Write a protein that binds this ligand. Structure first.
Ligand SMILES: CCN1C(=O)c2cccc3c(NS(=O)(=O)c4ccccc4)ccc1c23
Length: 133
């Protein structure tokens, strides 16, 4: 038989939502600090670029990524969410950050460049987090 299964093709899931009209939302002073200060200084770090958008498993040759990561999260998502006032409180935002890092530590091994980048960003996340309103 001449059906060799070269289609159908792989793909990336839909990225996380950055808007939801029926979700409860607020601006709080903690959440403004998260956008204005915390997110805007991890974002500038030179180890932040792999985290600035969702994992494109196809362009990046990580075809197991989404077999392994079932709750993906990334700083580009977190940034749009904040820009859209998507969170009800700071806990929800922070919990998105923990997820992004946790995912990184789950998919990869200690010593990997990407783990070094995440740890650097985490260490720093935590510092900026301590000085919250
Ligand atoms: C941060 C999310 N992420 C990974 O967990 C991961 C593992 C392996 C490669 C890459 C990756 N590929 S990359 O070419 O941009 C890159 C590879 C190694 C080190 C730094 C980036 C981007 C984002 C992630 C990974």
């Amino acid at each position: 038989h001449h059906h060799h299964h070269l289609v159908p093709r792989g793909s990336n899931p839909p990225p996380p939502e950055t808007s939801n009209p029926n979700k409860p939302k607020r601006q709080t002073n903690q959440l403004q600090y998260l956008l204005r200060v915390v997110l805007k200084t991890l974002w500038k770090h030179q180890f932040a670029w792999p985290f600035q958008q969702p994992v494109d498993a196809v362009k990046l040759n990580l075809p197991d990524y989404y077999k392994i990561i079932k709750t993906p999260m990334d700083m580009g998502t977190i940034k749009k969410r904040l820009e859209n006032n998507y969170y009800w409180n700071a806990q929800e935002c922070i919990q998105d950050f923990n997820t992004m890092f946790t995912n990184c530590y789950i998919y990869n091994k200690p010593g990997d460049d990407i783990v070094l980048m995440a740890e650097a960003l985490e260490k720093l996340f935590l510092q900026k987090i301590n000085e919250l309103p």
